[PDB]
């Protein structure tokens, strides 16, 4: 019937991503995102859950890969702090939890070469300049 590892469609809220050249997709540590369970709950107040207004695809500024490029990094939720109603909900509440679908995009041509390592690191503490 035609279906494939390489051809995917993702839809969240008012946003859809298509790809004709994927290498399957990864679910970190085998765990899909979930809301906080009552047995593991800690703040007692009724939570705010924005659903489609915040759980949707925000596209960040495009960077450029060149022969000089040593590498790029981002932190979550920080990269999304100014993104629509997600950022607003984040800055109005003391506490927040969130999972993410990260989709990195980089096409080229059958005559280009190169390989990007895309790593999702829990608690990615970086070293300082001093």
């Amino acid at each position: 019937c035609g279906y494939s590892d390489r051809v995917l469609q993702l839809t969240l809220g008012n946003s859809t991503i298509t790809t004709q050249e994927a290498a399957n997709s990864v679910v970190a540590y085998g765990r899909w995102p979930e809301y906080l369970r009552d047995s593991e709950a800690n703040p007692v107040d009724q939570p705010t859950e924005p659903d489609v207004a915040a759980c949707r695809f925000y596209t960040l500024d495009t960077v450029s890969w060149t022969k000089e490029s040593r590498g790029w990094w981002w932190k979550l939720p920080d990269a999304l702090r100014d993104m629509g109603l997600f950022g607003q909900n984040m800055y109005y509440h003391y506490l927040g939890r969130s999972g993410y679908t990260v989709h990195v995009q980089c096409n080229a041509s059958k005559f280009h070469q190169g390989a990007l390592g895309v790593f999702a690191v829990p608690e990615m503490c970086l070293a300082g300049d001093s």
Binding site: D38, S39, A41, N42, V44, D45, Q46, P47
Partner: protein, 50 residues
Amino acid sequence: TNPLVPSDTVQTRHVVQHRSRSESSIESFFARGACVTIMTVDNPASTTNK
């Protein structure tokens, strides 16, 4: 004293509580050896007048 809990004045979610008051029981509060005095004694030379 007014016996209120959070759900009486705010909208609350369901939380399954696991905390306990075990360490604040009267036994637990006092279950420790406390210093109540320091006694001084000696054993001098046979000669010393004191």
